[PDB]
Write a protein that binds this ligand. Structure first.
Ligand SMILES: Cc1ccc2c(c1)CCCN2C(=O)SCC(=O)Nc1ccc(S(N)(=O)=O)cc1Cl
Lengths: 405, 545
């Protein structure tokens, strides 16, 4: 198989990302995996003349005992993006998010039998570190298309197509979107039919080598920010009430407050129950009305990063919003719970990433309510996805927390 | 010394760049003479070789005597070629911690003469290693030369050499798992738990392996004896430690004396539990010259004392035992200073350490303590490949209270309360609900961006009121000031309604010590209080307040 030639982006060159301290159990796992891949000719030891580096971790994946290797190409992917995206970019079916059932199938194996352009390999260097730095890490590079590299699916697209062609012809109402190492298969069938069709599809794959996740999009919807209902209202509640209302306009056009407001005025005691005028009962209502609606005015700009912010709300529950432009939400939902905070944040992040892949075909940049170090040390304990999105660490505004509670 | 029949590492200059071509400066005759002398010596050994002036490349050469001695050393100034050579793979990117070495029956040190000069250099590369010994003054063509081995002070020498060393050892390891070799610079630490006998055998069997490869080394009666000095440590058969520390006695201290002192102490605190340093540091801030003498504070002096106390008579650390567990215990030692110990059997430390930094402007103890835990957790994974069981001066409950209602996600691995004062606590809760029958202050604070003056004040709901003026402030400062007033004129319980997300944020955090003075007062208030409930609202959307 003569190889498709791969360029970097002009004026920049490969990644040199530091590797992360890894725990013994993971290092062992990686030494096995990497022995076996070397045998299979997938990767080859390299010499000090490769300065490049990409971090590498081991995960386990939902309901699997088997350690599995996970390379972090986030840096490489930005340094190639011209190739994988604008140059060999996979179109995105707005249809996918409508279907009643989306099964998600791991397809990383595909790649493993396409050679990597010879002059690109050096870019895929990784290291297996050793405890206490007692021995220099084992350094490798890939000979075949690596998983988690955004180039891999791009290159491997036309094979994918041939592979998928017949099944596609025979079931013209099943959407199949590929994003990286996964295939998203969406159908409108009774679930059993669906499952059958998935199995049926597995056979096709299984004839070129290939070899779960059951999602039901169409039944994703609002999360209308909720204004307490109730007879009686302390100043506090009304205070807390306007406050929350206050937040909502800015993203919600038409919101209304001042009516509710004049209920306030003068230094009354907080814990003081107070009469309620019933036109100000209308704002309440018609805000409530709107408050369940989409933001009128907000569209997804395919030329612009997505961002996803996450807030913590005790009781094992977290809120989150996706948008491209502060306050103009494309979407906003919630997650609910032996789980700790981090374990949870990690599950949440994957959940959202994956919704996000299905809706837009790209992954958001996360703003996480956690300490950089902590997230870093801990997240691989729970990570089960084959991709890794982008993240930062931030200090939830005190009030953002409630306006969403 | 031989020259390795081994493979070769293909080097390369940076893309779109060419070799070096720097002119050779005129040299004195004696210098010129030494070079001729040195080179023909080297050249006799194939280390280097004669070339033409057809080869268009040149790097300069120099030659100096040697401190006091009566010999001559050749200097090559690779700067330029170094600056045109491809980047390599960082050499050794961590260094073992004694605390992590698994103890061994017997270990000996092998080193290696002609480190770099025993290993070949990619051939197509040598061309660029061109240099020239010039002819007495201007006249004549100088003599031209280039490298066959790895030149000293060239960019790739350290990587390639360490790489080679690794390729070589590879086999001998395979056929000897029970044996451990630590490569360092050009030294070899080798150890096993086999009896004095086949050790030296095994060693010799190594010195041979190294010979079949052009690597020559000391033989018994030449290699050093325990304790090995290395990287600042003292490594004995049983324990390890930092190297002899001498904290001198003097009357005057300069900014220099104190810096050096702080450094020695920090280094010593790896294994000397208790070492303190913050008084000494204060002395350093907003600083004059290096030669400047700083009068030791009295507190500072107590430190200097309490430190010599600890350092008076030795402490050692034990090695690591992959089988048993890791326990880490932390103590609060004072103003944002924490100190810890790790060991596997009650009180034989594998190491000690300290944590101080101040993450944030306002923080509380519980926060600080979990930062330590993380910092200790990482250091641990690096060193032992696993996280230790912790013992902390905080009740499970205090900890459960804080994490529970903290905006940020958080998470300590396994731990157990241990009762060693000071204990860590929250110094005040804040109400969940408004307080029935207790004054409601509506406070506010403003500041003229120009005059920079501000009014700060409040108006409660038993119609009381105050106002104040502030000469050089900001909005932020004013709003802390209001909440401060309202907290002062209200005794035991009070509700406060600010529209300052800023102040609110800070106080919802339960700070308990703060860079800001004003915030610290608010804190002394907050502890005196008995029931405070604080609440926010938007302003200019002007409201009941
Ligand atoms: C720099 C350095 C120092 C030391 C070591 C390494 C690297 C890696 C190999 C292991 N290693 C050791 O020295 S640990 C072995 C140990 O517990 N200490 C020890 C045991 C026996 C002996 S003995 N019997 O005198 O040879 C000497 C020592 Cl210093």
């Amino acid at each position: 198989i003569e190889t498709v030639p791969v360029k970097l982006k002009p004026g920049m060159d490969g990644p040199k990302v530091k590797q992360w301290p890894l725990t013994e159990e993971k290092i062992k796992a990686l030494v096995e995996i990497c022995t076996e891949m070397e045998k299979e000719g997938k990767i080859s030891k390299i010499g000090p003349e490769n300065p490049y580096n990409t971090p590498v971790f081991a995960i386990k994946k939902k309901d699997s005992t088997k350690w599995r290797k996970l390379v972090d190409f986030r840096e490489l992917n930005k340094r190639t993006q011209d190739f994988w995206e604008v140059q060999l970019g996979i179109p995105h079916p707005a249809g996918l998010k409508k279907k009643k059932s989306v099964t998600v199938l791991d397809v990383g194996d595909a790649y493993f039998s396409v050679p990597l352009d010879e002059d690109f390999r050096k870019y895929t260097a990784f290291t297996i570190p050793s405890i206490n730095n007692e021995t220099p890490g084992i350094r490798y590079q890939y000979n075949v298309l690596p998983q988690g590299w955004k180039g891999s699916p791009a290159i491997f697209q036309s094979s994918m197509t041939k592979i998928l062609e017949p099944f596609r012809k025979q079931n013209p109402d099943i959407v199949i979107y590929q994003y990286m190492d996964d295939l998203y298969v969406g159908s409108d069938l009774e679930i059993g039919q669906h499952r059958t069709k998935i199995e049926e599809l597995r056979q096709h794959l299984l004839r070129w080598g290939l070899t779960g996740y059951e999602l039901h999009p169409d039944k994703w919807t609002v999360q209308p920010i909720v204004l307490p209902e109730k007879d009686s209202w302390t100043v506090n509640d009304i205070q807390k009430l306007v406050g929350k209302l206050n937040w909502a306009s800015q993203i919600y056009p038409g919101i209304k407050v001042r009516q509710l407001c004049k209920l306030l005025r003068g230094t009354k005691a907080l814990t003081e129950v107070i009469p309620l005028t019933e036109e100000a009962e209308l704002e309440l209502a018609e805000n409530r009305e709107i408050l369940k609606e989409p933001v009128h005015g907000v569209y997804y700009d395919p030329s612009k990063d997505l961002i996803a912010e996450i807030q913590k709300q005790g009781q094992g529950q977290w809120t989150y919003q996706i948008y491209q432009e502060p306050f103009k939400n494309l979407k906003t939902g919630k997650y609910a719970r032996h789980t700790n905070d981090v374990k949870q944040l990690t599950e949440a992040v994957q959940k959202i990433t994956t919704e996000s892949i299905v809706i837009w075909g790209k992954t958001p940049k996360f703003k996480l309510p956690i300490q950089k170090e902590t997230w870093e040390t801990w997240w691989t304990e729970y990570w089960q996805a084959t991709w890794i999105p982008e993240w930062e660490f931030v200090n939830t505004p005190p009030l953002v927390k409630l306006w969403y509670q | 010394s031989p020259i390795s029949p081994i493979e070769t590492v293909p080097v390369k200059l940076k893309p779109g760049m060419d070799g070096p071509k720097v002119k050779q400066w005129p040299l004195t005759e004696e210098k010129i003479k030494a070079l001729v002398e040195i080179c023909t010596e080297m050249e006799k050994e194939g280390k280097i070789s004669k070339i033409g002036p057809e080869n268009p490349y040149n790097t300069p050469v120099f030659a100096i005597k040697k401190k006091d001695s009566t010999k001559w050393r050749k200097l090559v100034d690779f700067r330029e070629l170094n600056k045109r050579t491809q980047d390599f793979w960082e050499v050794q990117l961590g260094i073992p911690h004694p605390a992590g070495l698994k103890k061994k029956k017997s270990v000996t040190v092998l080193d290696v003469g002609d480190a770099y000069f025993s290993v070949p250099l990619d051939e197509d590369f040598r061309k660029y290693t061109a240099f020239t010994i010039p002819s007495i003054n201007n006249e004549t063509p100088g003599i031209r030369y280039q490298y066959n081995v790895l030149p000293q002070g060239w960019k790739g020498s350290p990587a390639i050499f360490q790489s080679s060393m690794t390729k070589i050892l590879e086999p001998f390891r395979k056929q000897n798992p029970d044996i451990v070799i630590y490569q360092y610079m050009d030294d070899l630490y080798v150890g096993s738990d086999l009896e004095i006998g086949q050790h030296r055998t095994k060693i010799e069997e190594l010195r041979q392996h190294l010979l079949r490869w052009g690597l020559t080394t000391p033989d018994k009666k030449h290699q050093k004896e325990p304790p090995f000095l290395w990287m600042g440590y003292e490594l004995h058969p049983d324990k390890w430690t930092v190297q002899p520390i001498v904290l001198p006695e003097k009357d005057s201290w300069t900014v220099n004396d104190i810096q050096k002192l702080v450094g020695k102490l920090n280094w010593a605190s790896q294994i000397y539990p208790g070492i303190k340093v913050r008084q000494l540091c204060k002395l350093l801030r907003g600083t004059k010259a290096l030669t400047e003498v700083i009068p030791l504070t009295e507190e500072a002096e107590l430190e200097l004392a309490e430190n010599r106390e600890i350092l008076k008579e030795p402490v050692h650390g034990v090695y690591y035992d992959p089988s048993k567990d890791l326990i880490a215990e932390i103590q609060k030692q004072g103003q944002g200073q924490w100190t810890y110990q790790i060991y596997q059997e009650p009180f034989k430390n594998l190491k000690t350490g300290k944590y101080a930094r101040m993450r944030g402007a306002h923080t509380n103890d519980v926060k600080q303590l979990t930062e330590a835990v993380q910092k200790i957790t990482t250091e641990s994974i690096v060193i032992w490949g696993k996280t230790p069981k912790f013992k902390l001066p905080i009740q499970k409950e205090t900890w459960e209270t804080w994490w529970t209602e903290y905006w940020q996600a958080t998470w300590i691995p396994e731990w157990e309360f241990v009762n060693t004062p000071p204990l860590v606590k929250l110094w005040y809760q804040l109400e969940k609900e408004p307080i029935v029958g207790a004054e409601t202050f509506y406070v506010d604070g403003a500041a003229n961006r120009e005059t920079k003056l501000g009014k700060a004040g409040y108006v409660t709901n038993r119609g009381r009121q105050k106002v104040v003026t502030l000469t050089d402030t900001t909005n932020q400062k004013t709003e802390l000031q209001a909440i401060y007033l309202a907290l002062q004129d209200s005794g035991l319980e009070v509700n406060i309604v600010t529209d300052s997300q800023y102040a609110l944020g800070i106080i919802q955090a339960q700070p308990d010590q703060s860079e800001s003075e004003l915030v610290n007062q608010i804190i002394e208030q907050l502890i005196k209080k008995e029931k405070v409930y604080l609440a926010w609202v938007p302003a200019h959307k002007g409201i009941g307040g």
